[PDB]
Amino acid sequence: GAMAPSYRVKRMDIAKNDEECVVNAANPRGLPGDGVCKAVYKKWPESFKNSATPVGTAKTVMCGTYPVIHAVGPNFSNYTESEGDRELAAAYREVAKEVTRLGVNSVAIPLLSTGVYSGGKDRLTQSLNHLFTAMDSTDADVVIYCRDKEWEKKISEAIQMRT
């Protein structure tokens, strides 16, 4: 575990993380995909061997000794708000199980279902709160990755609101 387990946020490409493992915002079929998933495919293509897994689940595949945790959030274009919310919470609980099993001291994680799976809605608070519910009981250093300056500010404020 980390000496003093913490949450941090960085505004940069998750493919350049400084953590002991990465969470992919994967699609269920293990395709190269878009956004975070395409950046992960470019950096760790070997990790896409038999990475297909259902919505609400996480499947880890090693690239060398570096673990890629493929976490499949729901596409809110297809799911109801209610069922989508349940599957999004479930995907993060499966990420916490994998991070724990791997014994890593740190993990790089994107906000699941906030990109092309958001159904055109702002889901920062919804996704981040489900991340906290899952990861609060783990002792890895969690580093959340985002793209946009306004998202970095709101994620940072939410982290500080608890400390």
Ligand X SMILES: Cc1cn[nH]c1-c1ccncc1
Q: Establish if 124 lies at the interface with ligand X (CB under 6 A).
A: no
CB neighbours of residue 147 within 10 Å: 15
Query: Which residue's beta carbon is nearest to the bound ligand X?
Result: 39
Closest distance to ligand X from the beta carbon of 67 (Å): 18
Closest distance to ligand X from the beta carbon of 155 (Å): 10
Q: Tell me which of Cl ion, ligand X, none is bound by residue 117, counting a contact when its beta carbon lies within the kind-specific cut-off of 5 to 8 angstroms.
A: Cl ion
Tell me: is residue 115 an annotated ligand-binding position: yes
The interface region with ligand X, picked from 10-18, 78-86, 96-104, 126-134 by CB under 6 A, is 10-18
Binding mask 40-69 for ligand X (x = CB under 6 A): ------------------------------
The interface region with ligand X, picked from 60-68, 82-90, 101-109, 144-152 by CB under 6 A, is 144-152
DSSP string across the chain: --SS--EEEEES-GGG--SS-EEEE--TT----STHHHHHHHH-GGGGTT----TT-EEEEEETTEEEEEE----TTTS-HHHHHHHHHHHHHHHHHHHHHHT-SEEEEE-TTSSTTSTTS--HHHHHHHHHHHHTT--SEEEEEESSHHHHHHHHHHHHHH-
Site for Cl ion in 2-21 (CB under 5 A): 12-13
Binding mask 97-116 for ligand X (x = CB under 6 A): -------------x----x-
Residues at the interface with ligand X (CB under 6 A)? 13-15, 35-36, 39, 110, 115, 145-147
